[PDB]
């Protein structure tokens, strides 16, 4: 499913991401925009053999099991395919585990290079939250 900007914001807010670990909603919508362009079915393979899945492009090396990433840890205890669902619940639950990790949202390269330090509030403006 391809989410609308405000539709995703509301869905993320309802799942408790607004200000989770101090990161405002704008940060999460911005990350999803540049990671997958709001497409829950987005997949991208990396040179190390791992693959990123879903709206938040969660990596198979440490967070989910896709059956083809040797030495993966599956920290979110879930099949990577579950992260491609129209229901973002799984991606959100795993993201909360990731952001609590230790490096915060810096775990997401697009957020560091394209969202961090910018006016993230702009991503939820005009929305009925
Ligand atoms: Na894994």
Curated annotation (Swiss-Prot):
Organism: Gallus gallus (Chicken)
Positions of the catalytic residues: 35, 52
UniProt feature coiled coil, ranges: none
Gene3D superfamilies with a match to the protein in the record: 1.10.530.10
Name of this protein: Lysozyme C
Encoding gene, per UniProt annotation: LYZ
Disulfide-bonded cysteines: 6-127, 30-115, 64-80, 76-94
GO molecular function: beta-N-acetylglucosaminidase activity; identical protein binding; lysozyme activity
EC number(s) recorded for this UniProt protein: 3.2.1.17
């Amino acid at each position: 499913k391809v989410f609308g900007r405000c539709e995703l914001a509301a869905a993320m807010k309802r799942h408790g991401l607004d200000n989770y670990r101090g990161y405002s909603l704008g940060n999460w919508v911005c990350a999803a925009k540049f990671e997958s362009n709001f497409n829950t079915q987005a997949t991208n393979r990396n040179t190390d053999g791992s693959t990123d899945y879903g709206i938040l492009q969660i990596n198979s090396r440490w967070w989910c099991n896709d059956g083809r990433t040797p030495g993966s840890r599956n920290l979110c205890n879930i099949p990577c395919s579950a992260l491609l669902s129209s229901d973002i619940t799984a991606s959100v639950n795993c993201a909360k585990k990731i952001v609590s990790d230790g490096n915060g949202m810096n775990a997401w390269v697009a957020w560091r290079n394209r969202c961090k330090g910018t006016d993230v509030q702009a991503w939820i403006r005009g929305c009925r939250l």
